[PDB]
Each structure stands twice: as C-alpha cells, then as structure tokens.
Amino acid sequence: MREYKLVVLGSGGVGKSALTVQFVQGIFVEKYDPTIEDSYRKQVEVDAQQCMLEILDTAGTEQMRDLYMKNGQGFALVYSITAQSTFNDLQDLREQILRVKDTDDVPMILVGNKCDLEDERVVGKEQGQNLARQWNNCAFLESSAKSKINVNEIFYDLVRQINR
Amino acid sequence: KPYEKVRIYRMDGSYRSVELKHGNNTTVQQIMEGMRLSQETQQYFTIWICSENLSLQLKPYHKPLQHVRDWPEILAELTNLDPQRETPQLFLRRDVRLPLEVEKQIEDPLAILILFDEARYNLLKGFYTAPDAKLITLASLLLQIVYGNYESKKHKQGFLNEENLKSIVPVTKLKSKAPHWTNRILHEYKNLSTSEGVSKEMHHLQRMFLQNCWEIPTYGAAFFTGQIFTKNHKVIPVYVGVNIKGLHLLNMETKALLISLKYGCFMWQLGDTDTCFQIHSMENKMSFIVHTKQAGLVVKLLMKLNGQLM
Ligand SMILES: Nc1nc2c(ncn2[C@@H]2O[C@H](COP(=O)(O)OP(=O)(O)NP(=O)(O)O)[C@@H](O)[C@H]2O)c(=O)[nH]1
Ligand SMILES: *Cc1c(O)ccc2ccc(-c3ccco3)cc12
Ligand SMILES: [Mg+2]
Secondary structure (H helix, E strand, O other), X not given: OEEEEEEEEOOOOOOHHHHHHHHHHXXXXXXXXXXXXXXXXXXXXXXXXEEEEEEEEOOOOOXXXXXXXXXXXXXXXXEEOOOHHHHHOHHHXXXXXXXXXXXXXXXXXXXXXXXXXXXXXXXXXXXXXXXXXXXXXXXXXXXXXXXXXXXXXXXXXXXXXXHO | OOOEEEEEEOOOOOEEEEEEOOHHHOOHHHHHHOOOOOHHHHOOEEEEEEXXXXXXXXXXXXXXXXXXXXXXXXXXXXXXXXXXXXXXXXXXXXXXXXOHHHHOOOOOHHHXXXXXHHXXXXXXXXXXXXXXXXXXXXXXXXXXXXXXXXXXXXXXXXXXXXXXXXXOOOOOOOOOOHHHOHHHHHHHXXXXXXXXXXXXXXXXXXXXXXXXHHOOOOOOOEEEEEEEEOOOOOEEEEEEEEOOOXXXXXXXXXXXXXXXXXXXXXXXXXXXXXXXXXXXXXOOOEXXXXXXXXXXXXXXXXXXXXXXXX
C-alpha cells in the first residue's frame, strides 16, 4: 500500500474543507469555519491498486506554506467560480510550487468549485480551461462539494499524476 | 501567526489543529468548542491524552497542555516505565461513561464515523474478543465500507491475502485463525453487496458495524495495565478493561479474554498501599488480585460506572 501526500490549496472560502470532508467522510459541511490545518486519511482504489491518501487541508492565508510544498506530492489548486479574486490568486501559488520543487513536472490540478451555484457564476469555464492550458496542459475540473460533482475525480487524478 | 495551536488527533491518524486562546491554560472544554462539532456531536466524545503505554481521559475542567508538560511525572506515578520513550498526544475519543442506550440512538453521520473509527481500531488491535462468527461478519462489513461493492472479477480469488486481511481482522488472528476464514468472509461480503435489504449508505454501514460491536463485552472499555499471579507462582501481564458493562481481564501478550464480569455479579476492594485491588466474583466462589499502580483509577472508575446503572 503506497502512501500519497496531497495538499489542497486556495484562497479562503473556496471550499477546500468542503471538498475534502465530502470525499473522505461523505458529509457536506454547510457551516463556515476557517481552517488552521487539517489532515485526513483515506484508503482508495486507483487503477486497480489500494492506495493510502493523506490529504492536507490548508488555510486560505496565514503562515508554513513552503513546508507543505516541499513535502506534498500532489497539489489541488481550488478557486470558487463565484469569486474572481480567488481565481487570480492561483497564479502566485502555481509559481511558488514550481519554485520550491525546482521543476515544472509537478502533479497538479485546477479545480473550480461551487459549480452548483451556476447563477452566481463570475469565472467562466472557458477562462478556467484557458488557465490550465497555459499551465502546460494542466488538469482541470469543475466541481461541487454540495452536489458531489467531480469530487472523487480530484484526488484520483492526482494519484495517477504521481504514479507517472 | 499571533496565536498558539495544538493538534487533536483521531484513531485513524487524522488530526485537527485548534487555536489556543488561553495558551497552556486552555481547558478541554475550550478546545472542544474549537473543533467542527455541534453540541449534538460533542456530548459523545472528549479529549484524551495518550502515549504508547498510557491513555487517560480528561475532563472539561482539565488543562491538557499542563498534562503534556507533567507527563514524565504522571508516567512515574501510574506506570513502571521510563518517561523518555513516551511522548503524549491529544486525541478525540469516545466518552467511557457514555451509556450504551444513548449510543444506540445516535443518528449524526459525523458522530457515527468517529465512533466507527475507534471501534475498528480496537478491533484490529485485538481488544474486542468475539466468537469467530461475529468477527467474520465485522470483516465483511469493513470490506463493503472500504472496498465498495463486491465484484467477482476482483475479489473472488487472489485478493484476500494477508496485506488486505490485516485491515479487516484482528492482528491476534491474522496468522492463526484468519487465513482459513477467507471463504466465509467473501460469502458474507458477496451477500452484503447483492442485497437490496441493506442500505449501502456510508453512515448506515458504519452503524451496522457498531451494532455488532455493542454485544462485545469489552466494547468502549478503558484499558489499564496490571499483573496477576498464578494460583508455582508465575506472573501474568494483563489488560484491565473497565466499561459500562463491567470489568474484563485480557492476557497482555495474546489478548485472550481471561474473565469478564457484569456489574452486580462481583465486588471490588482497593488494596491497602493502593498498589493493587481485589475482585471477589460472587456466584462463583472465586477471587483474584491485580497489582498495578493504576489500581486507584480502576476502582474509582468502577464505582462511577457501576453507580451510573439503574
Ligand atoms: N453551494 C455551495 N457551497 C459550498 C460549496 N463548497 C463549499 N461551500 C460553502 O462555502 C463555505 C466555505 O467552505 P469551506 O470548505 O470552509 O472553504 P475553505 O477553503 O476551507 N475556507 P478556509 O481556507 O478559510 O479554511 C461554507 O459555507 C460551505 O458550505 C459548494 O460546492 N457549493
Ligand atoms: C476519575 C474519573 C471520575 O471521577 C469520573 C469519570 C471518569 C471517567 C474516566 C476516567 C478515566 C478513563 C481512563 C483514565 O481515567 C476517570 C474518571
Ligand atoms: Mg477550510
């Protein structure tokens, strides 16, 4: 059983905890409690093999961000399709990860969360795909923790990106 | 960051960092409020402080970081260990005083999940002594909970080896009794998946796992270490399990159930120098004495849990 260390990053409010708790515990956290630092563990089957996932749910701001990057194997970059500022903050995070790993071959995925709030949408799906294209054909997904849409795929794809 | 924090672990290796508004003077109750728990979930759990060989449930008024600071002195009072190889951590665990009738009415999915992880941990460790039939049923539920539905193309042959087995059977049985249970485990696993009369929702399956654990005599037990002398005299290391049902004795080496006594079918007496306590099992004309520096806590817990019963 191989162990995978995944880190969920993004600005506050985007749903980093909601996506993680939904995937690990099957519960939708309706409340809002700003996270200090949460670590979850979960055993999954990716490509017909048992994996052990240690998922690190991080804070929106504050700070030890460099420790997460040096130790993390895969990174989920999450924004809310509801807030434009959370989308713009992700470029600085992508460059910070490449700087610390000292490479561009880094398991990564761009996640646009809260796609169940299609009405209050500010960031478009094409603009998110355009960003992932710019990021060396990075993986891209629109997800919803409330509706359980594309939740399991976020962490399954990071596992395949580490196996390569 | 302009604040202090501490990690609160669970049995599955996960943790949650909470802010420390009053530094080392923060209480269990203030930390309990710092978690993502409602008053519904909070009534079933509390903060424990545990090292490798000592686990202590704390109270709302306790300051856990001063217990961390004072750990080497606490280990010297209660154990015969060297304090160097023992660093404690804080855990969120089931309240040992939680009555079984209250646990049986729990519906919160998070509370069920937290109770499920503790029970699974105690099962794989070998602390839950149950017949071979009850253990096979629990192993098949774990297969459904962890590996999903049964599929003949995947689980029929060459799947329940020992690395996969280690996660569904007690470690005390993995070598002796388990490798001959594989056919019986898959049949119940196969029956669980292909049966619409059983809810495959996650909190429902975990609730089922706990139902089979509630009949186990050592369920929810707080465990202490001690010594008994054979009735020429040989020392036998023992675990002393005290729960809402009664008192139980495990062979420390093999976790075999020596004796289990429901409340009202035995009496206890604390030793003179505190270093021991005596158990007179009525309706059996038989007694025994357990030597342990934790004998004071064992008797104190026995009184409170017995006094809880109506
Ligand atoms: N409608 C809807 N609300 C969501 C979704 N994901 C999260 N939320 C809501 O958004 C709020 C913030 O979610 P949260 O998971 O705490 O985000 P976070 O990134 O962990 N915040 P922080 O970085 O400060 O810890 C909560 O009220 C939560 O219910 C979603 O997919 N749909
Ligand atoms: C000492 C005590 C009292 O007075 C009331 C309730 C308690 C519940 C649990 C414990 C305990 C478990 C392990 C170690 O101590 C003590 C306790
Ligand atoms: Mg959060």
